[PDB]
Amino acid sequence: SLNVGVVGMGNMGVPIARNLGFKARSAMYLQIHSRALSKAKRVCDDLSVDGATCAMRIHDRYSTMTKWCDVIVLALADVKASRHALLEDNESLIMNARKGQIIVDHTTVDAETSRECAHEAARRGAYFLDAPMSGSPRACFNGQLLLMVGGDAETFQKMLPIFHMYADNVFHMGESGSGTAAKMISQALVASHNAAAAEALSMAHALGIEDQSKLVQVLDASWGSSTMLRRNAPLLQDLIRNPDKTPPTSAVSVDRLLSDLAHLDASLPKRGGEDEPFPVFDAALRSLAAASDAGMGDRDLASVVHYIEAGEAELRNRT
Amino acid sequence: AAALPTFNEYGQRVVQPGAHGKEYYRVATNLPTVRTVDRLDVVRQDDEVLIWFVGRSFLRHQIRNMVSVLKAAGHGLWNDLELQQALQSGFEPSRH
Amino acid sequence: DIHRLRPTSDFKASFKDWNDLFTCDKRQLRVRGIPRMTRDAIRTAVQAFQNGNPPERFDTKEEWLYYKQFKTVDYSYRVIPELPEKYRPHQSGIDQAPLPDYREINKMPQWAECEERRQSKKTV
Amino acid sequence: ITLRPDATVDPERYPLGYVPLDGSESVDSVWSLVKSGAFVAPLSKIETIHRAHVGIRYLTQSEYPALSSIDVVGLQTRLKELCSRLLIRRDFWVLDDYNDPELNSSFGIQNMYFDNFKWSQVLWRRFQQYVEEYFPVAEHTHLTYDEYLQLLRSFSHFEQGAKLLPLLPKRYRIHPPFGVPALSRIDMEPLLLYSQWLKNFRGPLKLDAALVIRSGCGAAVFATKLNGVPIVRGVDPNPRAVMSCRKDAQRMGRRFDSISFRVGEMFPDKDDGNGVPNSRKYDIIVFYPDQGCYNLFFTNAIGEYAPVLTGFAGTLEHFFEEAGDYLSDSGVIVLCCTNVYSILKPTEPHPIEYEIKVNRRWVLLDYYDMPVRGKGTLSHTPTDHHYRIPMEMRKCMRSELWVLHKMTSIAHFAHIHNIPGAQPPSCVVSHWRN
Amino acid sequence: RMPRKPTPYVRKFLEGCPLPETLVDDIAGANLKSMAPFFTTAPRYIVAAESRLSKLFFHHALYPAGGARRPCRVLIVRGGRSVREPSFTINTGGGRGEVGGGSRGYRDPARRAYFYARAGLVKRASVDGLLSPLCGVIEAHFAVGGEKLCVTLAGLLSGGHGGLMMDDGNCASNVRAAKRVARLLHDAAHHLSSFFYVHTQLPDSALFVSRPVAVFRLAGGLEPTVHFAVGAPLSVLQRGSTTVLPFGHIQCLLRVRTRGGNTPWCNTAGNDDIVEPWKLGVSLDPKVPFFMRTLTEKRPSFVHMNHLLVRNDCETYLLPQRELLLSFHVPEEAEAMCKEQNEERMRRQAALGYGSPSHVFAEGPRTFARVLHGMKANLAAVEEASSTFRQGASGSSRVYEVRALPGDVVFVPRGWKYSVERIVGTAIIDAVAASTASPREALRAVFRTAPDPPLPSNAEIVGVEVDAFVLCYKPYPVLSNAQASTYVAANYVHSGIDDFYAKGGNDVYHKYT
Amino acid sequence: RQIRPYYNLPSKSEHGRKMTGFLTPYRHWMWKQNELWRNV
Amino acid sequence: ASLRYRRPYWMMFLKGVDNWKIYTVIQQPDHQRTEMLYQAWLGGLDRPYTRPKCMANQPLWLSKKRHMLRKERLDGPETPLEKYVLEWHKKFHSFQGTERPTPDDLHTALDLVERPLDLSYALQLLGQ
RNA sequence: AAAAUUUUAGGAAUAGUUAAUAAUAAUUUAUAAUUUUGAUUAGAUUGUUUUGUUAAUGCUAUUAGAUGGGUGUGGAAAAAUAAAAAAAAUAAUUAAUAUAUAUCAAUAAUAAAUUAAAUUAAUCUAUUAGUCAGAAAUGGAUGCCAGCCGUUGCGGUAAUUUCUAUGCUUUUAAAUA
Ligand SMILES: [Mg+2]
């Protein structure tokens, strides 16, 4: 058997440890680490009161977690916290890694971070997998998450029954650094399809089509179909026909998308030779940035439709 | 070897007259092609190779063929087996 | 996984979850890259679990590995020993039966000598 | 080989220079003798040296497993070292299981190729005269057992034919005399992809006069005549392979008539300026190079006044330089490799991509690849040990095919590069100009 | 019958030579018919095939059919390592049943081959991939004061001696285990970076308990076992009140580095500024142009400690984790036993005066005495060829060098000494250049598979690696004169083996009472 | 074919087969149920 | 999994032999010499003898003779208890014996103890 | 158990033998038995209105099989190896591949068969030749010679003639019906 240890408790860190306590019927030993010992004791008490089938341990430092667990899984809040916990700390998980350990990072970090984490784990002898999470916290509670694991192939085959305890769709992107890029490409496509749907419904209102409930039925059966087109169109109808109406706040925000989009331009090569080798990506990014600073950053992703013309403001005047 | 007794496709014993004793113990050549090369040196000078042939009598285009054989050996194309088979092949009285 | 030539446990990574295992027919098992006997065993176990028979069978690997080491031609769970060319001690160089040293084996052991010394001390 | 007993391991206990076997000790006891540098030869039976030959080659691969590219080149050097110590005597007819004229029983690989009645009556004497031409009784007091096995396989090619399947339709057989490397099942597959290429690209490309370089057994020459090329000419540096290939062209019917074989190093002569043989320009030049395990690894540059490369890269740069003088305009060259230069030597750059990108003398017109379907030995030099390809190398090998044309003939093939589904380079798109 | 198409010619009746069954039975060690006299000390190599090596064949490999008294051979088994999962009982289901016991041997090999198509970096596997998480929890137990690490290494020695032979008088075991590592640290004080080898038990960090009475399991979840190992494993008492150790028979061969005061790399070297002496004539090209030799690491310079790992209380099964070179020094009682047995068989079977020829295989009527003398001389040539003679202190014995790989099983008997070195790579030596000078100047291509060695009174413990797992079994019985005179291998082709190893030897009146 | 489940009586024997045909009474009862369903 | 058709019918239910493959090829002349030399190697016979064709073990008359001819391991009994051990094995340890001992016979062995070596012989009769 | 039907370019003898029998397991009796209406032996040899051809009761082909000393077991020796003939709990019975993939391993195409006309769907290519009425072919076979005359190895001489593919499955040469 293998001992498993989950590091970090936030809004997304708790249900992974809850599912690892539920589905592991005292076969794989569970250890819990957090940024504070009070939060780890709190989540251990929460796992204890609702029915715990496996014994779980609480630790305040990473050294006991390293010397006790074979598999370490991390679910932190930001990139810099995972960089501090994995590499920058004195009792680091990768710098003091045991040969044969398997360290999986579920945070959306840059490509160079996953590259240097894989390099330090390969020099220490361990195996580092980067598998950024995509999904809802309640979908994580129900056990539905999207994971794009990059790392070794046989190490990925060793981690499939552990990954199937809290995620349905777990795919192998290839070598390390390819898993953290898939979330960047996915959210870039999300932003581009949202901008395209906003522009298409703006042109639909410009052409004078009054029935949008039948327009989405044909637009879903065409070649220009997308899931974001199915998602945003009932809200975009009210945001177009009532432009004075403020958009409602959502769980996913403009800043939540731009936080992952802020990792992509640092992980991409230098664009200054041609100044724009990505037209619709920056065309969506400027509209999201114009929607952020105007006071609509925390609201829904359908707020791009009021700032479509504002995406042209950084193109006419900067050139 | 081909003139020794062998069973044919129908199983009956056939034997060619080459492995008989008159053509079996037959010497290779009849013409005086047995020649002496006293000295055959390959000297690598600066920027060139010099093949020295010191011998009393030579055959027609013998030196110009030995130079071609030595050039083919310099590129690494033969072995001892092919050289011995070429030397025991003897004289070929046909231009084509 | 009960058979040696049906490595069922080698293809845990060939399915994502329970429903994908239980919905795939033999053509989908063929395109996933599974050999014939293995995919036949997988499909038979799935169809037996669908009929109400869980996979409760004894693993016949070690028993067959025990029975393999003999020279049964049909693998019929028999025991056929190999007969070497020399099966008697006289033809392997040994001249006659070994005689035991009857004076060596009839000596009194060390505990018996110690108890005789203790008896000679305690009697007087 | 004639042994010198003064330079052996133990010249006092074994004054003949070798250790006779007598067929009693185990194979790993013989394998420890050969690893220490001692020669072994059979005393009474060929079965003792044949059991020592198979078991040593299996024990050496167990000690040096083929785990990467550098483990195969080391195993080939070790197996060539050990199999040279496994000797057999020159007078093999004095051994016990050579032939029995009364029971018609024999040991050796001649039972796989010949009949038991035909060997024990008449063919034991014809094989005795067959060894005398290549390995005489005077110059050799002992033979390597791999030389004895190759003499038995080449005696079958001398007696009966050798079918080239599935290259030749079941009735055209060649006779490689001795020292001419025949093709295995793996060696046939680069010529099977070429024969499918020539079946479709003859007539769209107007391929009439083909030239084959380094023919060897002549299997690449006969596959071109079968696909419809009227004029084929072969060039082989082995003179005995040239005489045998043109004799098999007469034996293979009347549809192999315009086939010619000359002796040349790589290309024909082209030295006489007054005889003008420059009027014979070929439109397709075929090259099927050999890829041995010692040939792919030691490729490096040599020469001060004439700096030349060695090995597989030096053979390619000979073919890539002199082919323009024998090609016609609007003509192509076809190269058939086996992707082992990229497997056995992954640190060095690609030698065919080094000609196109750097030298800029040839333009990549077409390139095909196909995975390897069969198993066996690959580019086997005849008098050496047999080494079949392991499973992990066989699933990575591919049958490649490179079709290149001249840099000066871009404007003729410009309408081939602008079709959909092709990859024209940056120099061809500048010369088309719509 | 079979449908055969008629031909107007004769039919070829091939009697073609197949792969011999006796050859693969002797290579795999499953022959059970070879009567081999003249017991020798040369090691025996056995290539493990699938389902061909068990306790039945390995018992005859230990005790051959000639009537031996002691397994006095080193037995190398290529690819014989097995991996066992822990077994557990299913409480749910239709009933109570125990599952999970299975062997991963002979199907999951060590060092999977890495072939790919695109000074130079190639891809290889030098460590065993299955037992590497088991190696990690042992190597992290010694990772870091220095005195605590020294007492950790002294507290974990196998049986108090750890394989090392040192004179210790008026001393208990717990002080002897400290004196041995004190002698090693005093010896390794002069070199900046040196190493030594010890036998150690499994630490408590590698053994975790499971609640169901109490079941201990390994940290990696895999147990290194040998399925063809005969007899019972060695039982060692836990001291802390004496109970048995849960995994005491599985030991470790630790290489420890000292301080004083999977990407191999290949490089092809060139040189700046009588070829075949065995061949009589002069050849235009050499028959063997290149040599291949195994590259071993450097031993630091050398009173001097013994540095020989000797297990006098158990039989040793070495499962290497890296490429090692083992130099076996033969004990004197084994070669004395083989010498007296061979000379007894010579004076019994060959009582003739032999005629006194020039050499053994001379021309003349091959009688039984000449066949026996030829077989004895070939055995002597095998012993002299595969061994070398070293010097010790006034002592000299045979030294057999054995190339051990990851995944093999090397059986070492009790009383056999061995030095262990690490194989670092593979070199290629040109034969024409080695005819004039040493082969160090004749190097053409060098593959370095081990890029290990870093460069950042007493000595300090730097690091600890495990090179092999030592499976220690209980000492196999030595037969007497009467037991070996009546020992027949044909009585042990089916059964009686576990009673041969449980009871002392075999019965003197077995199956003829 | 007679099914040998994992929860039958194990024969701890190194000279033969590792599992006997001795059932559990639950196995006897469910075999009787399947016998009746075949008997119809 | 039966040996009904692999070995002769007189080897039906046959267990516990040394090697039953010996007794299928006894009639071959090189194995017929090996059987008669083995009966001379076992002693007890004044003439050359082969065991019968339908027997794998030794016959009942022959193993009774070799058990009676076998010299006892204890030679030269000093104590009358050690003479009683030789009377115990001739009576209660004969070949294919039927009669069991008596608790009064154990009392006779427990009444002849003189030295502490006699208690090792007497208590092992108590264990039988 | 019975009837019944084979062949030899240079045609002759055969026998553990025929019948009777109070005879299993033949100590006897007999003028015994096969064969010129073709025997025994020797050669060839599974047979078979199944194949091919023709106007043809003609000619010509064949691959169902069996097996007195390996074991008296078994009802029956047919027993040293066969992709099913599913083999005593419904293992599975939707389908198509039903095998490679029972994937490594000494070993060689020597050899054994075979001869097209889809066996799942995720868009997108298929379709011999700038035709050769006969002109071409570094395409085969192939030498000869005296230089005033010694093992110097110059030249005529880049020798000349003789067989050819292909078109042209409208087809032409070879054998048989
Ligand atoms: Mg009468």
Among C58, C66, C77, select the one facing F19 at the smallest CB separation: C58
d(CA A301, CA A303) in angstroms, rounded, equals 5
The pair phi, psi for residue D312, each rounded to 5°, is: -75, -35
- Give the Cα separation of A18 and A30 in Å (integer): 10
What's the angle, vertex CA D148, arms to CA D146 and CA D153, rounded to 5?
95
Q: CB-hemisphere CA count at 13 Å for E222?
A: 21
Q: How far is the CA of G28 from the C1' of H16 (A)?
A: 30
Residues of G with CB below 8 A from C76's CB? 1
| Type and span of the H or E element at E180 | helix E173-187
CA distance D125 to D93: 9
Tell me the CB-side half-sphere exposure of residue E480, using CA atoms within 13 A.
11
Q: Which two three-digit tokens encode residue G117?
A: 């070596």
B51 touches strand H (CB under 7 A): no
Strand E120-121 to E97-99 pairing: unpaired
Q: Which pair of tokens denotes residue G38?
A: 């083995």
Q: Which residue has 């090996």 as its token pair?
A: G34
CA Rg value for chain B: 20
Q: Is D170 left (phi over 0), alpha (psi -120 to 50) or beta?
A: left
User: How far is it, in rounded angstroms, from Cα E298 to Cα A314?
Assistant: 67
Q: Distances in Å between the alpha carbon of F9 and those of C58, C61, F21, F35? A: 11, 17, 7, 22
User: For residues E162 and E179, what is the distance between their CA atoms, to the nearest angstrom?
Assistant: 12
- Four-CA torsion A212, A214, A218, A224, nearest 10 degrees: 20
Q: Taking a C-beta distance cutoff of 8 angstroms, is the pair A17, E236 a contact?
A: no
Distance CA E289, CA E275 (A): 9
* R_g of chain G computed on alpha carbons: 21
B84: nearest CA partner in chain E:
E284
Question: Could you please report the per-residue DSSP string of A93-127?
Answer: TTTTPPTT-EEEE-S---HHHHHHHHHHHHHHT-E
> Could you give phi then psi for residue D180, rounded to 5 degrees?
-105, 115
Q: Any idea what DSSP says for residue E309? A: B
Give the nucleotide at minimum CA-to-C1' distance from D272: H158
Please report all neighbours of G, defined by 3+ CB atom pairs within 8 A: C, E
Partners of residue B10 in chain E, C-beta under 8 Å: 8-10
Q: Per CB distance under 8 Å, which residues of E are interface residues toward B?
A: 8-10, 283-285
Number of other residues whose CB lies within 10 A of the CB of residue D349: 14
- From ligand 1's centre to the CA of A148, what distance in Å? 109
Neighbouring residues of E204: CB distance < 8 A, sequence distance ≥ 6: none
- In the block, which residue shows the tokens 């017109």? D365
User: Is C36 within 7 A of strand H by CB distance?
Assistant: yes
Q: Which one, of E36, E37, E44, lies nearest residue E73 by Cα? A: E44
Positive or negative CA dihedral for C31, C34, C37, C39?
A: negative
Beta-bridge mates of residue E389: E398
CA D115, distance to chain mean position in Å, is 28
Of E129, E140, E211, the CB nearest to A98: E140
* HSE-up (13 A, CA, CB side) for residue D125: 12
User: Nearest Cα to D323, choosing from D337, D312, D311, D335?
Assistant: D335
> Are the beta carbons of D121 and D101 closer than 8 angstroms?
yes
The helix or strand, by DSSP H or E, that contains position B45, with its residue range, turns out to be strand B39-45
Cα D64 from Cα D59, distance rounded (Å): 9
Pick from E99, E77, E68: nearest CA to E318: E77
Whether E398 contacts E339, CB under 8 Å: no
Contact E428, D88 (CB under 8 A): no
Owner of token pair 């004969």: G94
What the block records as the tokens of E105 is 């041997």
C-alpha closest to that of E447 among E429, E465, E431: E429
Q: Which of B7, B72, B81 sits opposite D122 (nearest CB)?
A: B7
What are the beta bridge partners of residue D18?
A: D39
Q: Which two tokens stand for residue D173?
A: 């057989």
Task: Write out which nucleotides of chain H lie closer than 7 A to a protein Cβ.
Answer: 46, 61-63, 65-67, 71-73, 77, 79-81, 87-93, 98-114, 128-130, 137-144, 151-154, 158-159, 164-166
Instruction: Give the CA radius of gyration of chain A.
Output: 22
Q: How far apart are CA E105 and CA E85, in angstroms?
A: 11
Residue of E nearest to C5 (CA): E107
A38/A9 Cα distance (integer angstroms):
11
The set of residues, in sequence order, having a beta carbon less than 8 Å from that of E223 and lying 6+ positions away, is E83, E84, E85, E86, E247, E250
The DSSP symbol for A144 reads -
D259 touches D221 (CB < 8 A): yes
Nearest to E9 among B10, B73, B83 (CB): B10
Q: At what angle do helices A254-261 and A179-207 cross, to 10 degrees?
A: 130
Number of Cα atoms under 13 Å in the Cβ half of residue A245: 13
CA of E4 to C1' of H67 (A): 20
**Which residues neighbour E131 within 8 Å (Cβ) at sequence distance 6 or greater?**
E83, E220, E222, E224, E319, E321, E469
Q: Is beta strand E398-404 parallel, antiparallel or unpaired with respect to E388-389? A: antiparallel
Distance CA E461 to C1' H31 in A: 121
CB burial of residue E76 (10 Å; 0-12, 13-18, 19+): buried
Q: Cβ contacts of residue E504 below 8 Å, gap of 6+?
A: E477
Alpha-carbon distance of D398 to D401, in angstroms, equals: 10
Q: Is D326 exposed, middle or buried (0-12, 13-18, 19+ CB in 10 A)?
A: buried
Is the omega angle on the peptide bond into residue C54 within 30 degrees of 0, that is, cis? no
CA distance E117 to D372: 14
- Reference E35, options D29, G29, D25; nearest CA is D25
- Min Cα distance B60 → chain E (Å) is 27
- Helix, strand, or coil here: A293? helix
Q: Where in chain A does DSSP place strands (E)?
A: 4-7, 30-33, 56-59, 71-74, 102-105, 127-130, 133-134, 146-150, 169-174
Q: Which chains touch B (3 or more CB pairs under 8 A)?
A: D, E
Q: CA end-to-end span of chain F, whole Å?
A: 21
Structure tokens at E504: 């002392």
> CA D88, CA D147: separation in Å to the nearest integer?
9
Element (H, E) at A193: helix A179-207
Please give the DSSP secondary-structure letter assigned to residue A257.
H
- In terms of Cα–Cα distance, which of B7, E145, E48 is closest to D123? B7
Report the distance separating Cα E144 and Cα D381, nearest Å: 57
Residue B81 DSSP SS3: helix
On whether any CB of chain E is under 8 Å from the CB of F26, the answer is: yes
Taking CB atoms and an 8 Å cutoff, what residues of chain C touch A169? 16
Residue C61: list chain E partners with CB under 8 A: 102
> Which technique?
cryo-EM
CA–CA separation, D77 vs E287, rounded Å?
11
Q: Where are the alpha helices (DSSP H) in chain B?
A: 62-74, 80-89
Write out the two tokens for E16: 């073609």
The radius of gyration of chain F from alpha carbons, rounded to an integer in Å, stands at 13
| Main-chain phi, psi angles of E327, to 5 degrees | -100, 105
What is the Cα–Cα distance from B85 to B87, expressed in whole angstroms? 5
Mutate to test the interface with C, among E50, E55, E83, E485 (most CBs of C within 10 A): E485
Interface test with E, best of F3, F7, F31 (most E CBs within 10 A): F7
Q: Which residue lies nearest H99, CA-to-C1' measured?
A: C36
Chain F positions in Cβ-Cβ contact with residue C58 (cut-off 8 Å): 4-6, 8, 18-19
- Among A316, A245, A263, smallest CA distance to A286 is for A316
Amino acid B65 CA to nucleotide H143 C1' distance, rounded Å: 22
- List the one residue out of F6, A165, F17 whose CA is nearest residue C54: F6
Contact in structure between D256 and D222 (CB atoms under 8 Å) = yes
Task: Tell me whether residues F24 and E99 touch, CB distance under 8 A.
Answer: no
Chain D positions in Cβ-Cβ contact with residue B79 (cut-off 8 Å): 179
C-alpha distance across the termini of chain C, in Å: 77
| Å between F23 CA and nearest CA of chain E | 10
* Virtual torsion, Cα D46, D47, D52, D53, nearest 10 deg: 70
Q: Packing angle between helix D219-226 and helix D185-200, nearest 10 degrees?
A: 30
Q: What is the dihedral of CA D344, D347, D350, D354, to 10 degrees?
A: -140
Residues D174 and B20: their CA atoms lie apart, in Å, by 29
SS (HEC) of chain D: CCECHHHCCCCCCCCCCEEECCCCCCHHHHHHHHHCCCEEECCCCHHHHHHHHHHHHHHHHHHCCCCCHHHHHHHHHHHHHHHCCEEEECCHHHCCCCCECCCCECCCCHHHHCCHHHHHHHHHHHHHHHHHHHCCCCCCCEEEHHHHHHHHHHHHHHHCCCECCCCCCCCCECCCCCCCCCCCHHHHHHHHHHHHHHHHCCCCCCCCEEEEECCCCCHHHHHHHHCCCCEEEEECCCHHHHHHHHHHHHHCCCCCCCEEEECCCCCCCCCCCCCCHHHCCEEEEEECCCCCHHHHHCCCEECCCCCEECHHHHHHHHHHHHHHHCEEEEEEEEECCCCCHHHHCCCCCCHHHHHHHHHCCEEEEEEEEEECCCCCECCCCCCCCCCECCHHHHCCCEEEEEEEEECCCCCCCHHHHCCCCCCCCCCCHHHHCC
The answer to whether C13 contacts A157, with C-beta atoms less than 8 Å apart, is yes
Six-digit token string for D249: 């062209």
How far apart are alpha carbons A19 and A165 in whole angstroms? 6
d(CA D141, C1' H15) / Å: 63
CB atoms within 10 A of CB C124: 5
Q: At what angle do helices A279-291 and A254-261 cross, to 10 degrees?
A: 140
CA dihedral A62, A64, A66, A70 (to 10 degrees): -130
DSSP A249: B
Question: Which two tokens mark C86?
Answer: 């020399």
d(CA B37, CA B60): 14
Q: Chains near D, with 3+ CB pairs < 8 A?
A: B, E
User: Diameter of chain G by CA atoms?
Assistant: 61
Q: How far is CA D187 from CA D192, D217, D389, in A?
A: 9, 12, 12
Using CA atoms, how far residue A100 sits from A2, A72, E20, E129, E142, in Å, is 11, 11, 44, 9, 16
Residue E214 tokens, joined:
């109490």
**Rounded distance, CA E108 to CA G26, Å?**
46
- CA–CA gap between residue G110 and residue A43 (Å, rounded): 76
Quick check: helix, strand or coil at residue E411? strand
- Interface subset of C 36-65, CB within 8 angstroms of F: 56-59, 62-63
Query: What is the gyration radius of the CA atoms in chain E, in angstroms?
Result: 27
* Cβ(A94)–Cβ(A128) below 8 Å: yes
